[PDB]
């Protein structure tokens, strides 16, 4: 490195960014890799981009402290890096799954039926609450396609007489992503009804800001946590409001009456925010933030 103010100031800026948020340099590197700023060197960040990074770090660290999730835990939840070695858990899963599965079922075209078949063993190996929850986890992983594998591809790979040359990489990547999603759901304490609605809708109910919906990253995880908090706070009419949001019949008056707000306040909040229909959690969150301020 060249010893100047600019380089020394860049390194000191990184150290400050760690220190002010109570992260070690390793934790800062992990959070940066998870952030939407990864792949971009901090010295090559625009004068408007740097405050965005600082505010993202602040909000993420605050959320982690509030929800009692360690940085190592969130790194394990969201990292794409995987061991690459077949684990004893996966070995037990495959050995238990092989007798109870057939090539006709593997090559069938009903991904719903395949998920129903695979659900009990996935729940057993992931210590999940119920086979329904495991089925929705499987459907979410199928939507993601981690290593390019779908449910049918995973089933075909299971149906092999140890004929795994380098498809072991695909198999372990699929299993790792599935375990990561299950661990994220368990950490968030997401309910099976919420997961069912979101996965069936393809995360269009949750929404995403300028991103394709349904991706597994720390931003969608934070959005899921906030959405779950709002659903919990809704109370008894929570299920009906979630059903109306799964449909497209959620209106400003109904939202105001459910949340106990004033209808004039809610209407002005939508008009100021620029949203005309409460289509998704993004719109609801924007309206609620305007009401908050």
């Amino acid at each position: 490195i060249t010893l100047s103010v600019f380089v020394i100031s860049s390194l000191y800026r990184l150290t400050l960014l760690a220190r002010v948020h109570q992260l070690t340099v390793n934790e800062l590197c992990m959070l940066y890799g998870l952030s939407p700023f990864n792949g971009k060197t901090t010295a090559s960040l625009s004068s408007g981009e740097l405050p965005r990074l600082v505010i993202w770090l602040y909000q993420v660290t605050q959320w982690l402290t509030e929800a009692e999730i360690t940085t190592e835990a969130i790194w394990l939840l969201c990292t794409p890096e995987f061991s690459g070695n077949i684990s004893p858990e996966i070995s037990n899963l495959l050995n238990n799954l092989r007798p109870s599965i057939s090539e006709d079922m593997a090559q069938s075209h009903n991904r719903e039926l395949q998920a129903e078949i695979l659900a009990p063993f996935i729940a057993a190996t992931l210590h999940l609450a119920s086979p329904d929850m495991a089925r929705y986890i499987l459907l979410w992983t199928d939507n993601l396609r981690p290593g390019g594998l779908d449910i049918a591809g995973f089933m075909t790979l299971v149906l092999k007489e140890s004929l795994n040359a380098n498809e072991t990489t695909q198999l372990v990547q699929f299993c790792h992503v599935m375990a990561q999603l299950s661990l994220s759901v368990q950490t968030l304490r997401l309910s099976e009804a919420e997961l069912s609605v979101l996965v069936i809708s393809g995360f269009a109910v949750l929404g995403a800001k300028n991103q394709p919906a349904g991706q597994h990253n720390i931003d969608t995880l934070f959005s899921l946590y906030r959405f779950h908090q709002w659903i919990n706070g809704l109370g008894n009419p929570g299920s009906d409001t979630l059903d109306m949001l799964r449909q497209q019949t959620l209106t400003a008056d109904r939202l105001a009456s459910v949340m106990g707000l004033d209808i004039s306040m809610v209407t002005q909040a939508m008009v100021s925010a620029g949203v005309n229909q409460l289509q998704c959690w993004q719109d609801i969150n924007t309206v609620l933030q305007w009401i908050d301020v």
Binding site: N92, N96, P120, F121, A123, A124, T125, H127, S130, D132
Partner: protein
């Protein structure tokens, strides 16, 4: 008094070690979370397959009854024995009824 306070600190430390020991014994238990999880996963898969076989038997017995009475309009296995509200439980009671 300071000696008494320090021994209270050590008492708290011993309590923390005791809770550690309880957690480790719970995890080394024979009937632990992994055992229960694998047992109920196996039983859930078995129950899922057995319901299909049992409903097939019920349907073919109903066909035998329809043949015996020469009344094709009687329907007793109306479906919905395996309902999502109860995760498949009470299917056996429904089929017994």
């Amino acid at each position: 008094r300071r000696e008494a306070a320090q021994m209270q600190v050590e008492y708290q430390e011993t309590q923390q070690a005791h809770t550690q020991a309880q957690l480790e014994l719970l995890q080394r238990k024979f009937t632990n979370k992994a055992l229960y999880s694998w047992m109920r996963g196996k039983l859930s898969a078995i129950y899922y397959q057995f319901f299909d076989l049992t409903q097939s038997f019920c349907l073919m017995a109903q066909e035998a009854l329809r043949r015996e009475l020469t009344d094709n309009g009687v329907t007793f296995i109306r479906g919905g024995a395996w309902n999502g509200t109860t995760a498949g439980l009470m299917a056996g009671e429904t089929l017994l009824l």
